[PDB]
């Protein structure tokens, strides 16, 4: 098995002389073949805060990581890394990572306080933002790295360890090489899978500090309850293939692809790649937005319904999605608030609006249940309502449906909830 | 590797037109090929309590789970499931599970409060008993599922994840994809010429069945025909898998020390210390129509050496395999030790469930002390003082310590008597 | 994949008639082909405390474990084990481990209260020191075992489970299970040494607890791994603390030798007790030379850079470059010793002084690094190094170095650290 140098949202050269070293919400880094050298260009999306620049690479950096404070570069074969702070007030530094025969740097990342290097032999080397060595650990061979502030999210693979992930903050490991439930891959894109065998398109922390990964199955995975070792769970919160299928009107397209950049609360910042290649090429299009959706849609049922004719989605199928999505986001946001506090200023209102949408979707499900003479299923749905005003609304729907026992029982719920 | 639809104690079609979808202590579900459709029959062992029924299957359900409240059916390719309550007062419901290209349902299970679906892509979908979605999780590819009340026991396999299991209660995960110490089948040249090859094509993992015991402890039964039980699962750091029944070994002892290849065990459930099963006779290891009457196999710890058992059962006969009391006591001590720990944990956490647990536990701890005393007597009979004293420290009841003293006196070991009395004095004082 | 009987620092027969069953800090056990039987010799390094003895082996023991209380022997095919207490007051006992067809005993170990057996089918069988069966468990196949006092360090492997380890402490009056089959970040192997890799497929040369009770392993990559913070489940980490290949390369003057090899016996604080094997074989042979010593070194050096520096100037290492290794090594050892003291207390009588001297070497290395930072007018990098200083007198010296380097802002900021720490007392 060959360990290849990984960087978030990086693209292959292909048949061109240029490619993207890395991409995210901050910007993107490109390198161009220039004879015996390379031409690196660091670009940003917010031109008001940052100033795009260029320089010549004499080493051939194939590793890169970009944040709001600086840019980190690495050469997987020689072991040379270089950190370049955005503000020239702070000076650049270059270091050489010790490598045994056959050992390659597989992934690098950087925070305002840490610089991290992982190798194919499972060496984990950390530094501060100035290049001072702080630790040298032995882990399962690292294949992917991301970091946000003090949190570090690593992915490991070996034929003797399997596919795992680790999550650490400043040292403390919430997760130590726990199994990672990401799907692995099974053509014009042959160049990509030689470039990224794992098929990890990108990985990152969300805007609220939750670990996310986006693999070859084009599904956004989010780790919930990562603060609770026994309550942790990976959530599929966006099947990008399905949503595109619904956008395109139910046709099997092979010209639209998603390239993940970041997750902002409920919206995936991405690049819509159009063509035969699944990876974006120069020039880079304008960043798009894709709202997350729980994988509760059935393609077959969607085909049955949409025979007469965007794909139209049934109220109950849509109510289930909105119910689950609100439930998921509510738990995450509540955890973030109770542990890390308000971060952007509107969380209490966002959470409030969230619990409202949670109840509306449930009532839609409650109505269909009553509309199907299903008494027991309706009562079960009633118990899942949060606000007392929602239980009140449930009674009104229950009265119109000629279900007296339901009305009593829902009122009995109000009796218990009063206490 | 092909992910195949799994169901507890399910059997393959083979070259016949009928098979069992699933089996347990409640009953068994069979399906028969009927032209372009299937004929499903749900049968029960307690004919007084439940009503056997039939219906025609137009979808081709290859997944099934059976409990005391209802029956769950699943179609691995279309993603269609159907829950059928035993009492017609409660209505049936059918749902279609979202499936990606190539994704198959690999296992389903149901409790009075939960309905669970697992797929080959590692999607884990849970519902209430009425079909209301509660959660959608991503895990390692699921190959087997079982559930009891709010607890869920899943088995996972991938060539990139290995063989693992999870234990959860609804949310909380006592165990998250921890290694599962279960043997996998060995499909070599002899197995490819074997008559039971159809079973391992139908169930690659060789998991014959898995279930929670009557006291709520996770059990699994694989191709090595050994019942495995997860002890101390409530304490994440103290958990351990216990081989509590080598069915190959026990049949070997029943048969008088001979290697039979015509008797096979088909696991249904575990009730305290007794494995509810079907004794299959023939060349096939899976039960066939008509289904024989359920048997009962008592659990035994695998601590015996086949050669040693032969020597002893030869000496006894010239003076089933007969086992010397002192030798058998080692197995009896360990089995009682194991069952006592399990039951004590069950009581302290979940209380009496059937009403007699405290009496069962009392009788259990009694057999525990008796076996220890037999080992203690053998130690004393060999002038092994240190070994005898070590056994004494493992005694539970104070009256057992007293009996140990008499054995020490009859064996004329006075120093032993003093130390054993100091144990009683020390334990008396600690109260 | 073939499971093979493992014992710590055990060697293969090769083309000779003798080999070592196991070697550790206590002594070594050897077996010699004696016609149709074997001649086992149990030897000790402390000839004053223990008594070397011999006996004839009619069973063909290929498994062995030696501690301060007794010697454990095992036959992987018949399943026969025998525990031999060093003090003849306690009688020997022999047991036969139940084995299915093809099942082999893969590893054994012993504590003062337990005798442990692991098999290739993943069976785990324990006994007390007198032969009373205590447990029969099913685990991931155990391939290596070591023990110190009441602590047990196991290694597991299967093609369906991967490479893992477990750490437990079952004492006289307390149970504690620190690690249960967590992933083990050890490297696996990929000729004259062919006899050894058929003898030890995993390539685990040896594994053991350090003299202070920390788990160590030494694999085919000849790098000593040490488990730090193993008492804290969320803080645990494996540390590469000795690349023996790298250190030999530095001893030999930067040349790639293929005739000098390390055979690990134990870890004493900061020193690896080992046998320096010279020749084509990587394993020691009879008769055994005198044990050597190898001081641990953090793998933070680049071969190319070391050569350039030693040409511009054994390999000579610049003070500013060597300080990084010394800083990290002291940092690592300090954390370990601090953990050991707070939990298990003083063990040998000099620990409080060792720790003090350790924190002193820690501060010196930082100050030398701090000087280099000042020497490059790098204020922020220098200030960051200052925050890592322990002693207030070290902060005082840092000010002095900051003054001499004409970095006034640095002097001001470092004083604020001293000021803040003064009130926070």
Swiss-Prot record, chain B:
Q: Where are the WD repeats?
A: 222-262
Give compartment(s).
Nucleus
Transmembrane segment boundaries: none
> Which cysteines are disulphide-bonded?
none
Function field: Accessory factor for DNA replication. It plays a role in accurately duplicating the genome in vivo.
Q: Additional info?
A: Present with 3280 molecules/cell in log phase SD medium.
What is the official name of this protein in its record?
DNA polymerase alpha-binding protein
Originating organism: Saccharomyces cerevisiae (strain ATCC 204508 / S288c) (Baker's yeast)
């Amino acid at each position: 098995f060959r360990y290849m140098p990984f960087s978030p949202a990086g693209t292959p050269f292909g048949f061109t002389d240029r490619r993207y070293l890395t991409m995210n919400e901050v910007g993107y880094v490109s390198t161009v073949k220039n004879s015996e050298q390379y031409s690196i260009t660091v670009s940003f999306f917010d031109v008001g805060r940052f100033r795009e620049y260029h320089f010549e690479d004499l080493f051939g950096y194939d590793l890169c990581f970009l944040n709001e404070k600086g840019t980190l570069f690495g050469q997987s074969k020689t072991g040379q890394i270089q950190y370049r702070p955005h503000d020239s007030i702070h000076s650049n530094w270059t270091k050489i990572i010790p490598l045994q025969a056959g050992e390659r740097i597989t992934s690098v990342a950087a925070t305002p306080v840490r610089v991290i290097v992982g190798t194919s032999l499972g060496y984990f080397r950390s530094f501060n933002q100035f290049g001072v060595p702080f630790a040298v650990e032995k882990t399962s061979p690292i294949v992917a790295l991301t970091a946000q502030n003090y949190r570090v999210f690593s992915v490991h693979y070996s034929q003797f360890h399997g596919l795992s992930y680790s999550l650490s903050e400043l040292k403390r490991y919430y997760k130590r090489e726990c199994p990672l439930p990401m799907s692995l891959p099974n053509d014009a894109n042959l160049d990509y899978y030689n470039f990224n065998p794992m098929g990890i398109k990108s990985l990152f922390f969300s805007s609220y500090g939750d670990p996310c990964i986006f693999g070859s199955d084009n599904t956004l995975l989010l780790l919930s309850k990562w603060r609770s070792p026994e309550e942790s769970k990976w959530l599929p919160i966006l099947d990008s293939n399905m949503e595109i299928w619904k956008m395109s009107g139910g046709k099997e397209t092979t010209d639209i692809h998603v390239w993940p950049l970041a997750l902002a609360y409920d919206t995936l910042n991405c690049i819509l790649v159009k063509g035969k290649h699944i990876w974006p090429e120069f020039p880079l299009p304008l960043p798009s937005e894709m709202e997350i959706r729980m994988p509760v849609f059935v393609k077959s049922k969607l085909l049955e319904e949409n025979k007469a004719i965007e794909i139209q989605i049934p109220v109950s199928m849509a109510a289930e999605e909105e119910y689950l999505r609100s439930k998921v986001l509510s738990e995450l946001l509540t955890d973030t608030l109770e542990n890390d506090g308000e971060m952007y200023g509107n969380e209490n209102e966002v959470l409030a609006a969230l619990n409202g949408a949670y109840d509306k979707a449930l009532l839609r499900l409650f109505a269909s249940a009553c509309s199907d003479q299903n008494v027991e299923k309706a009562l079960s749905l009633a118990h899942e309502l949060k606000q007392d005003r929602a239980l009140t609304a449930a009674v009104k729907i229950s009265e119109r449906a000629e279900l007296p026992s339901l009305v009593k029982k829902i009122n009995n719920i109000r009796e218990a909830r009063y206490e």
